[PDB]
Amino acid sequence: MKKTKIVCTIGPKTESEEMLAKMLDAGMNVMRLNFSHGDYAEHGQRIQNLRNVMSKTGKTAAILLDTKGPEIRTMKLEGGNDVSLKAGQTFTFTTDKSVIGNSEMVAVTYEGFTTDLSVGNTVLVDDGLIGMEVTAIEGNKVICKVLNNGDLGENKGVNLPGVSIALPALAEKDKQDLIFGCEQGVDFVAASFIRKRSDVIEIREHLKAHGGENIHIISKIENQEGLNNFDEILEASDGIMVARGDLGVEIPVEEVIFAQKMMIEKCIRARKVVITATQMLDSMIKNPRPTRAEAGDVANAILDGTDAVMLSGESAKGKYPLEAVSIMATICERTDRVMNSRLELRITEAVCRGAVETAEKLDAPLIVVATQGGKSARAVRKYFPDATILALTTNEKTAHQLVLSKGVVPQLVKEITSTDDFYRLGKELALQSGLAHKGDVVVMVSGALVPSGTINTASVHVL
Amino acid sequence: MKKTKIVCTIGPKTESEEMLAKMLDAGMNVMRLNFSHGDYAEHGQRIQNLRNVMSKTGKTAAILLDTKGPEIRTMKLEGGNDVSLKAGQTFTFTTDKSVIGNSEMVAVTYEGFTTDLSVGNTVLVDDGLIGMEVTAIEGNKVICKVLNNGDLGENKGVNLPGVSIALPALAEKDKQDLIFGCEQGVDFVAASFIRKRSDVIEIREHLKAHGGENIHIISKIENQEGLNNFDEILEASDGIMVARGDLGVEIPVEEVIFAQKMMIEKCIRARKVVITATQMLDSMIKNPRPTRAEAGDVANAILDGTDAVMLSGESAKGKYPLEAVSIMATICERTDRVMNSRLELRITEAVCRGAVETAEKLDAPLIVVATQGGKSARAVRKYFPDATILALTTNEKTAHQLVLSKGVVPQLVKEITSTDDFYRLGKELALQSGLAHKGDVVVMVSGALVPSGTINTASVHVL
Amino acid sequence: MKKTKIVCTIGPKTESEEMLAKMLDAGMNVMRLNFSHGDYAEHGQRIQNLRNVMSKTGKTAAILLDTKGPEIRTMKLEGGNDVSLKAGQTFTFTTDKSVIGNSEMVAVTYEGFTTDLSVGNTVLVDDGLIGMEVTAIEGNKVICKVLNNGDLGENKGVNLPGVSIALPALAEKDKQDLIFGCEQGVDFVAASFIRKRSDVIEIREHLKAHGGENIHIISKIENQEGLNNFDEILEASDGIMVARGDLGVEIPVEEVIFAQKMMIEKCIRARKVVITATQMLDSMIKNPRPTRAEAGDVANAILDGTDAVMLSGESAKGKYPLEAVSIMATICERTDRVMNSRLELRITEAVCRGAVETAEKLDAPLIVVATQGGKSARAVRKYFPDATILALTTNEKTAHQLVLSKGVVPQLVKEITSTDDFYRLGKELALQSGLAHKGDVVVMVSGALVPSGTINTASVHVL
Amino acid sequence: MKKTKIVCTIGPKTESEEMLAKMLDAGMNVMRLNFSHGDYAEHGQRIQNLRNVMSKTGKTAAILLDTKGPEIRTMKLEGGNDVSLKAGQTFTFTTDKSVIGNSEMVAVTYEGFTTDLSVGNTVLVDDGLIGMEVTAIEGNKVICKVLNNGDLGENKGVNLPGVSIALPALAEKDKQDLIFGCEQGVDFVAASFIRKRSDVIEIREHLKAHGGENIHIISKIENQEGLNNFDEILEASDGIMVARGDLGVEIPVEEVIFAQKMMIEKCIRARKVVITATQMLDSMIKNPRPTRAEAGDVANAILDGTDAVMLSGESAKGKYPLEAVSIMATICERTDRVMNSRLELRITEAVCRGAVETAEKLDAPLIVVATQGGKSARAVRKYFPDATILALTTNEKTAHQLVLSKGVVPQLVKEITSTDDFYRLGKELALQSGLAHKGDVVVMVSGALVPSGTINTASVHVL
């Protein structure tokens, strides 16, 4: 079966226990809650429904909370009517939130709009529909030249390519949503619009103050500043979400593919999970089959080395959610099938790399790893083993979180008290899992006489 | 500058000499004539305009004739009105060309429709818009069950996934178009819907009977039968066009990416040019910028190893042809920039592989190759050299055809009569080309005391 | 310190406890008792003296009993006077032991002399001093033509190059000497003139009949038949002694070097100990320093990969025994210093090869191995690790025997009852041994949940 | 056939044309004239006889003149009688040449004996037979303590281990012998006791002053100072002779093997010929077969990579000269047979390394090299090609000198005027040589459009 993991955004058409059970059957591994919409009762019910399905079926899934994040948006227009902007005309943005807009001026929600912009910068409105060039800044106004014809509606997103925007790391709504995440015991938080290390630290401190210190932070990289600061963002985060659609509006289009490839590569080296998201199978919101191009896009992200792929509207509100998951899983299995190990100085990396190499040389279908916080399992996954990884842990949070790592099957166990006990138990559970059978070789990895989080032992057993 | 070559379909908005000159400036290397449309005067004028621009500017380009090919199409409907087909209804195709269609039956243009199909086969209509399952075949009728709702218009294409269709290799119109190609001295013919070796042989014999034995045949692989017979098709052809859009309708969608990757890989090994085509930058027919996904699709085809990428409607009839070529070239240069050589038993391969390796070890910016029919230049290109390839030939047809090979700069010369003369002339032309300068190392490859088409000499010179 | 081990033949000048202690100080690892001479009281006293020194100093050494073996020798001559044989003359050997020899005929000790020889065979007398060609065999006579001038003395050795000699595997005296060796608890038996597998088996069955089932048999390869049957001899033996001087008389002289190299390499591959012996430092029987040629010969044997080197007359009866051992150790250390690991499918070899590689990648000075019969320690030594091997065993005989393996330090312990206990103890003993210090990395190898003799675990610890 | 070349010292028993022809038949490649003995008429006659044999048989050989060199020797003793010196006694050397020696004092031939020695230095007499330690130096006396018992004869050699001796590079007799060598057109001069760069330069300037600028200088490395200065000596020389016997007296005995190995490896890297000499087959001066130890020593020198091996007394004055040469050739062929190429930034090394690799990948039995001074042929030999090297040259001296390089067959030709002419001629000569046959692949190496001594072309041809 596939190794790549599937994140599904859950919404009205997929929130019932019946639908969720069918989603898991088709290959869903992680439920994404998009807090751009819905209230707390709605999201809490979805969590309840999934956990009901999990306990009834004994299947394991993880829950990811995806924040709305801070934004720059235009505001209202006279009579609520769209206005037609003409290439070459003058157009003005104002930070005065009380102003109602027309064909010459509109208000924006961000007070720092005048401060952060410079003459010559580009202002993009409505997912890049309309481009403008700043010609002057005076008082609370940014005067611009419209670069292309377009119709401006109300409440449209604004992008400032290449600008360092002094928006807070968290909207006030985001802060309450994170408390809800701690209350609900979510496994991951995907933090929107991460631009710098200090953004991640604030989210870390906020989660810690509400008992969520074990919740993993997935930073969403969406603009050039986040790209420039990627190394420090990754270091402070537990993982990364590559938001291709936002990057497509924020950086030169020919760069987006290499931003994805390099971010995936760096996450792999850092033993941190990476999700490829947005613009995956969007056409399946309306159609029962994806496009050739969409299928290729998904497969190339897997070949790039992503841990997981994500469905958005096509699983949350679209008309063919089950078809989308199913064809996603089919693409995953077809692509995982043809990938090879990557066997390219620390004790943990020496032992994990050697264990994968030993497994391949002995045709081992399974690597068994003892792990407390999941690091051990991710250190083996780094080398793209042909073998499946059976991760044994006493930590429920770790067991849920490892559901997102490529090719990892987590298993919650009663604590193992010695290295020999780990070999005895792992052999039994290897057989019980159906992932290996009598006579198969399995490689077992653990830490002996060391603090948690260090791997220093590799062991080969016949079942 | 980029190494990947760009094929541009030329049409009304790009056929003037002024536009063509701007197309070349932006990165166009090969003009495609799509004989699905236009008459002979129209295509002949485009050839004349390009050759005018070539002689005036001294720039080199190639001309590719892309055949319409044989087809299966539905026919007319009552009153010319679309009809609404309902999932589950019975629907019948008839080979009786005299029948006017309605919501229950329509005629098809192919007499063998009844012969080639079987109960259980899938019939796709209008680029897969409507799917049907054959339930019975009687006389001149194929009775089907409609699988999904759809509106059937007139004269729509029909696809039969996984069926071996006994259509001729060439439509009658194709045969006359090939004579026109010989009359005009085109450099390539892209042959539509190639399914088996004998299809290529017929085209070869037809071209030979009209003085076109030196025209290279690019076989378009569009369905499962062509995939199954790919090895023999490639062997008989001079190159391959990967028609992704057609494959998307003809084979399981998760397979299309690997059909592309494997066909490119095999062409590379066979020293035969490969073009990746269709569904590249289609959105630019209407928009001045492509989508993030389109840009990624193009770049991944380059990383796969394609020689060339192709523009269709976006350069022929679209509103932003120059923008499309320019961003295509930008993607090409950005992607070529980060690719590495591939240095993985015949004398020619031993010498060409060694020459590339020597060039890389000595930081040679240029490999100079003496070639008669172009094979030598393509044998060096096989290893993806960092260095540019300067191909010297007395053969005008070869000089034009090498314009399509990745990273090859062709140069027509007066015949060289000895190996030492080749070193003297190549050094001078190396400097004149501006591709290398005084003090640079260049590696020079040629055949000494051997029949044309064998490479057995490698030589290193300082300019 | 050196890794190559030194076998010293002990005699009158080196048998006292005082001399033995200084021999160990200078680098002696194994005492060889040459049972060609000395009676049981003398050899028993030497064994007692070594064990006294071992108990007093806490040093570990092994005891090797070297059998005389079967021989063919000429007999006596008239008046005990030498005779001069002439090239081309007729000379006859007779199996009649009652015959007194002269310049025309002499007796030999072996009844099968007539049976095993053929017309055309070469008969060599006195370490090849005199060659003869069989011209006829009649009754108890072998008639020969003398091939070269020489002086024949009494009681000279006879060699039959390329002939299969049907001598018994054991002389009658050898059988009693082996029983004495079992009584005394020797660690190795070196069996002279091993020609075939059955010779090794016969010695094994004799030892088993007198409680010597754990004594390792080192087969001495001395002639062409042993070379021809080497693979089966090695398989049946525990180790090999390369007797270069004897081979130099039995096979073409240009082949001896490659016979030594081939045999050493095969022993390494089989994880079986090999000794290089004879014509090592013979000149030091009379001189206090060896020859340039001798020193080079020894060093090249070490570079070939021998486990051990052996002193014969120069440590047993010569005038400079301590100088011989000391310069030998100097050669060993000087040559071992510049040798590298050899890292090249069984579980044991996969784990042991990986453990050596891990040790080298982490600059581990020490590999700790748990072993019962020594196989595990010898499996690590196979890869010529930079690190010293500390072999922990509960088996006293194994501890002695491992003294002969290159780069192994054995240590007798109280049995370890678990894998974690093995790591705790090995770390302590690593520090106690002085072979590693606080902060050093050590790699520990053992078998977990497997029968003795299987290695399936590798573990990395910081001291 | 062997690739390693054989230098034979010619003397009374091997000087006739008849013997020389049989010496060449048996494997001799180079004649060494040891000018320690013989007068000019004798050496001139030997040169004449070899050239007669060469012209009659068409075989190619080289002539090497080996200088006596400077020495320190003791002088005469009272009554010409040996004296016995006692360990611990006082013994004095005096530079007063008029003094007649006895058991307490003897004269030496070198005035600088007092200057170059220091209190604590070791004085060795008679190939290290007797060691003495300087205790004081006063006037023309070196007072020593005898370190070991020994018998002092007259006119014995003196060695000063680790001392820089200020002897002139050339004895007065050496200067005349070198002029004679220039007059006679010898191909090599072997310069004895080279200690430093300036010694090589002095010999060079003498040869240049008498028309010997093309004679190659082989520096004999014989003591520690030469070892210390080896890199600069090699740089200044054309080749090296490793004098193992002399080094065995001057440096620690365990170091001699690695001094030989290091020096051979460095010569290979520098593309300069190396000879292994002294203590090769000395026992064959009296015996018709060598010792096991001698044969092994020679073979290990070949495996180390020496170009040539040298016979001294055993071919010049011994009783079995032809047997010595023959068994030497047998050892050479037996050892060369099992050696492999060594394929490891200049243009010459890139092209030559690639040519060897191409030859091996294509099973080419022959590499043809165009060379003026021999550098090109020696640059190919550096990689130990399986193929034989056919070196085409117009230079008679180069043709002779290349006889000493491993695996090179030189061939004198009429000048080639182009690269294509070189391929035509080399193919013909490849076939004429019997080293390759119809259908074989040959690789041809030369310089095109470059000054002599640059190699920049590699070419592959089928015969």
The answer to whether A448 contacts C420, with C-beta atoms less than 8 Å apart, is yes
Residue type, A414: K
- Residue A237 near residue A201 (C-beta atoms within 8 A): no
Pairing of strands A158-159, A188-191: unpaired
Q: C351 — contact with chain A (CB < 8 Å)?
A: yes
Token pair recorded at residue C368: 């700790």
Q: What gap in Å lies between CA A217 and CA A240, rounded to an integer?
A: 8
Place of tokens 């949350």: A316
CA–chain centroid gap for B139, Å, is 39
Most B-contacting residue of D353, D419, D442 (CB-CB within 10 A), to test interface? D419
CA–chain centroid gap for A256, Å, is 17
Q: A418 — contact with chain C (CB < 8 Å)?
A: yes
Q: What gap in Å lies between CA B375 and CA B377, rounded to an integer?
A: 5
Token pair recorded at residue C99: 């015959």
Place of tokens 């969409």: A294
Residue type, C171: A
**Could you give the dihedral angle defined by the CA atoms of residues B454, B455, B456 and B462, in that order, rounded to the nearest 10 degrees?**
160
C-alpha dihedral sign at A7, A9, A13, A19: positive
Backbone angles phi, psi at D147, to 5 degrees: -90, -20
- Residue D28 near residue D8 (C-beta atoms within 8 A): yes
Using a 10 angstrom Cβ sphere, with 0-12 exposed, 13-18 middle and 19 or more buried, the burial of residue B39 is: exposed
Chains sharing 3 or more CB pairs under 8 A with chain B:
A, D
The answer to whether A448 contacts C419, with C-beta atoms less than 8 Å apart, is yes
Q: B149 — contact with chain A (CB < 8 Å)?
A: no
Q: DSSP letters along D361-407, please?
A: HTT-SEEEEE-SSSHHHHHHHTT--SSEEEEEES-HHHHHHGGGSTT
User: Which one, of A255, A192, A185, A248, lies nearest residue A221 by Cα?
Assistant: A192
Give how far Cα C459 sits from Cα of A442, C210, C254, C284, C450, Å.
17, 40, 46, 46, 16
Distance from CA of B2 to the nearest CA of A (A): 14
Q: Which residues are within 8 A (CB) of A84 and not within 5 positions of it... i.e. 6 or more apart?
A: A103, A149, A150, A151, A152
Show which residues of A are catalytic.
32, 73, 220, 278
Give the number of other Cβ atoms within 10 Å of residue D93's Cβ: 29
Most C-contacting residue of D249, D263, D284, D292 (CB-CB within 10 A), to test interface? D292
- Residue B9 near residue B311 (C-beta atoms within 8 A): yes
Q: What gap in Å lies between CA A420 and CA A438, rounded to an integer?
A: 19
Domain extent, residue B113, equals: 78-159
The answer to whether B362 contacts D351, with C-beta atoms less than 8 Å apart, is no
The answer to whether A254 contacts B334, with C-beta atoms less than 8 Å apart, is yes
Q: What gap in Å lies between CA B46 and CA B49, rounded to an integer?
A: 5
Map residue A456 onto helix, strand or coil. coil
Cα first-last separation, chain A: 21
Backbone angles phi, psi at B292, to 5 degrees: -50, -45
Q: What gap in Å lies between CA B264 and CA B301, rounded to an integer?
A: 9
Residue type, A393: T
The H or E element containing residue A219 is strand A216-221
Q: Which residues are within 8 A (CB) of C440 and not within 5 positions of it... i.e. 6 or more apart?
A: C364, C365, C366, C430, C462, C463
Q: C448 — contact with chain A (CB < 8 Å)?
A: yes
Give how far Cα D405 sits from Cα of B293, D6, D189, D304, D334, Å.
64, 10, 15, 15, 18
Pairing of strands A308-311, A5-9: parallel
Strand partners, A94: A107, A141
Cα first-last separation, chain B: 21
Residue D189 gets the label, from left (phi > 0), alpha (psi -120 to 50) or beta, of beta
The answer to whether D460 contacts B456, with C-beta atoms less than 8 Å apart, is yes
Give the number of other Cβ atoms within 10 Å of residue A36's Cβ: 12
Establish whether B122 is a catalytic residue.
Answer: no
Q: What gap in Å lies between CA A69 and CA A173, rounded to an integer?
A: 8
C-alpha dihedral sign at B249, B251, B254, B256: negative
Distance from CA of B246 to the nearest CA of D (A): 43
Establish whether B291 is a catalytic residue.
Answer: no
Exactly one of C220, C271, C378, C381 is catalytic; which is it?
A: C220
C-alpha dihedral sign at B82, B88, B90, B96: positive
- Residue D24 near residue D18 (C-beta atoms within 8 A): no
Q: What gap in Å lies between CA A161 and CA A133, rounded to an integer?
A: 11
Token pair recorded at residue A241: 């979400």
- Residue B72 near residue B167 (C-beta atoms within 8 A): yes
The H or E element containing residue A306 is none
- Residue C136 near residue C113 (C-beta atoms within 8 A): no
- Residue A263 near residue A242 (C-beta atoms within 8 A): yes
The answer to whether A457 contacts C456, with C-beta atoms less than 8 Å apart, is no
Cα first-last separation, chain C: 21
Most D-contacting residue of B345, B417, B418, B456 (CB-CB within 10 A), to test interface? B456
Chains sharing 3 or more CB pairs under 8 A with chain C:
A, D
Q: DSSP letters along A223-266, please?
A: SHHHHHTHHHHHHHSSEEEEEHHHHHHHS-GGGHHHHHHHHHHH
Rg over alpha carbons for chain C, rounded to the nearest Å, is 24
**DSSP 8-state symbol, D100:** P
Q: What gap in Å lies between CA B253 and CA B126, rounded to an integer?
A: 17
The answer to whether A420 contacts C418, with C-beta atoms less than 8 Å apart, is yes
Distance from CA of C358 to the nearest CA of A (A): 7
C-alpha dihedral sign at A370, A371, A376, A380: positive
- Residue C389 near residue C399 (C-beta atoms within 8 A): no
Q: D331 — contact with chain C (CB < 8 Å)?
A: yes
Map residue A116 onto helix, strand or coil. helix
Most C-contacting residue of D253, D283, D330 (CB-CB within 10 A), to test interface? D253
Taking one residue from C and the other from D, the number of pairs with CB-CB distance under 8 angstroms is 83
Token pair recorded at residue A85: 């902007």
Using a 10 angstrom Cβ sphere, with 0-12 exposed, 13-18 middle and 19 or more buried, the burial of residue D340 is: exposed
C-alpha dihedral sign at A176, A180, A181, A182: positive
Q: Please list every residue in chain D whose beta carbon sits closer than 8 Å to the beta carbon of residue C148.
A: 288
Q: Which residues are within 8 A (CB) of D460 and not within 5 positions of it... i.e. 6 or more apart?
A: B347, B350, B351, B456, B457, D358, D362, D364, D441, D442, D443, D444
Greatest Cα-to-Cα distance within chain D, rounded to the nearest angstrom: 77
Give how far Cα A74 sits from Cα of A109, B175, B254, C376, D419, Å.
6, 60, 41, 74, 76
Q: What gap in Å lies between CA D92 and CA D140, rounded to an integer?
A: 10
The answer to whether B331 contacts A254, with C-beta atoms less than 8 Å apart, is yes
C-alpha dihedral sign at D236, D237, D242, D247: negative
Q: What gap in Å lies between CA A312 and CA C252, rounded to an integer?
A: 81
- Residue A349 near residue A304 (C-beta atoms within 8 A): no
Q: Please list every residue in chain D whose beta carbon sits closer than 8 Å to the beta carbon of residue B357.
A: 354
Q: D218 — contact with chain C (CB < 8 Å)?
A: no
The answer to whether B457 contacts D456, with C-beta atoms less than 8 Å apart, is no
Map residue D240 onto helix, strand or coil. strand
Distance from CA of D16 to the nearest CA of B (A): 48
Q: What gap in Å lies between CA B6 and CA B64, rounded to an integer?
A: 12
Q: Which residues are within 8 A (CB) of B209 and not within 5 positions of it... i.e. 6 or more apart?
A: none
Pairing of strands B28-34, B5-9: parallel
Greatest Cα-to-Cα distance within chain C, rounded to the nearest angstrom: 77
Most B-contacting residue of A254, A300, A337 (CB-CB within 10 A), to test interface? A254
Distance from CA of D355 to the nearest CA of B (A): 9
Q: Which residues are within 8 A (CB) of D358 and not within 5 positions of it... i.e. 6 or more apart?
A: B350, B351, B354, D364, D443, D458, D460
Q: Please list every residue in chain D whose beta carbon sits closer than 8 Å to the beta carbon of residue C245.
A: 292
User: Which one, of A285, A277, A271, A291, lies nearest residue A382 by Cα?
Assistant: A271
- Determine the length of chain A: 463
User: Which one, of D181, D241, D170, lies nearest residue D214 by Cα?
Assistant: D181
Pairing of strands D158-159, D122-125: antiparallel
User: Which one, of A307, A241, A316, lies nearest residue A31 by Cα?
Assistant: A316
The H or E element containing residue D427 is helix D419-432
The H or E element containing residue D356 is helix D347-361
Q: What gap in Å lies between CA C326 and CA B122, rounded to an integer?
A: 89
Distance from CA of D299 to the nearest CA of C (A): 8
Token pair recorded at residue D18: 């008849």
The answer to whether C291 contacts D247, with C-beta atoms less than 8 Å apart, is no
Distance from CA of A350 to the nearest CA of C (A): 7
Q: Which residues are within 8 A (CB) of A185 and not within 5 positions of it... i.e. 6 or more apart?
A: none
Using a 10 angstrom Cβ sphere, with 0-12 exposed, 13-18 middle and 19 or more buried, the burial of residue A365 is: middle
Token pair recorded at residue B305: 């190893």
Q: What gap in Å lies between CA B306 and CA B204, rounded to an integer?
A: 24
C-alpha dihedral sign at A158, A162, A166, A172: positive
The answer to whether C293 contacts D290, with C-beta atoms less than 8 Å apart, is no
Q: What gap in Å lies between CA C155 and CA C178, rounded to an integer?
A: 25
Residue type, C318: G
Q: What gap in Å lies between CA A9 and CA A23, rounded to an integer?
A: 11
Question: What resolution in angstrom units was achieved for this structure?
Answer: 2.1
Q: What gap in Å lies between CA C355 and CA C348, rounded to an integer?
A: 11
Give how far Cα B440 sits from Cα of A457, B462, C321, C398, Å.
53, 6, 67, 66
As a three-state string, the secondary structure of chain C is CCCCEEEEECCHHHCCHHHHHHHHHHCCCEEEEECCCCCHHHHHHHHHHHHHHHHHHCCCCEEEEECCCCCCEECCEHHHCCEEECCCCEEEEECCCCCCECCCEEEECCCCHHHHCCCCCEEEECCCCEEEEEEEEECCEEEEEECCCEEECCCCEEECCCCCCCCCCCCHHHHHHHHHHHHHCCCEEEECCCCCHHHHHHHHHHHHCCCCCCCEEEEEECCHHHHHCHHHHHHHCCEEEEEHHHHHHHCCHHHHHHHHHHHHHHHHHCCCEEEEECCCCHHHHCCCCCCHHHHHHHHHHHHHCCCEEEECHHHHCCCCHHHHHHHHHHHHHHHHCCCCCCCCCCHHHHHHHHHHHHHHHCCCCEEEEECCCCHHHHHHHCCCCCCEEEEEECCHHHHHHHHHCCCEEEEECCCCCCHHHHHHHHHHHHHHCCCCCCCCEEEEEECCCCCCCCCCEEEEEEC
As a three-state string, the secondary structure of D411-424 is EECCCCCCHHHHHH
Backbone angles phi, psi at C256, to 5 degrees: -60, -40
- Here the contacts of C135-138 (C-beta below 8 Å, separation 24 or greater) are C135/C90
Map residue D97 onto helix, strand or coil. coil
Backbone angles phi, psi at B314, to 5 degrees: -70, -20
Give the number of other Cβ atoms within 10 Å of residue D14's Cβ: 26
Token pair recorded at residue A23: 């989603």
Token pair recorded at residue C29: 């690892």
Q: Which residues are within 8 A (CB) of C139 and not within 5 positions of it... i.e. 6 or more apart?
A: C114
Strand partners, D159: D124
Q: B424 — contact with chain D (CB < 8 Å)?
A: yes
Distance from CA of C253 to the nearest CA of D (A): 6
CATH number reported for the structural domain that contains residue C87 in this entry:
2.40.33.10
User: Which one, of D22, D20, D2, D3, lies nearest residue D11 by Cα?
Assistant: D20
**Could you give the dihedral angle defined by the CA atoms of residues C345, C347, C352 and C355, in that order, rounded to the nearest 10 degrees?**
110
Establish whether B32 is a catalytic residue.
Answer: yes
Token pair recorded at residue C450: 């497997």
Report D:226-245 residues touching C (Cβ under 8 A).
Answer: 244-245
- Residue C187 near residue C63 (C-beta atoms within 8 A): yes
Strand partners, D32: D9, D64
**DSSP 8-state symbol, A38:** -
CA–chain centroid gap for B123, Å, is 27
Q: A253 — contact with chain B (CB < 8 Å)?
A: yes
Map residue B448 onto helix, strand or coil. coil
Q: What gap in Å lies between CA D443 and CA D390, rounded to an integer?
A: 10
Place of tokens 């830490």: A447
Chains sharing 3 or more CB pairs under 8 A with chain A:
B, C
Q: A419 — contact with chain C (CB < 8 Å)?
A: yes
- Residue D333 near residue D1 (C-beta atoms within 8 A): yes
Q: Which residues are within 8 A (CB) of B385 and not within 5 positions of it... i.e. 6 or more apart?
A: B341, B356, B359, B360, B367, B407
- Residue C131 near residue C166 (C-beta atoms within 8 A): no
Q: Please list every residue in chain C whose beta carbon sits closer than 8 Å to the beta carbon of residue A420.
A: 418-420, 448-449
Q: C125 — contact with chain D (CB < 8 Å)?
A: no
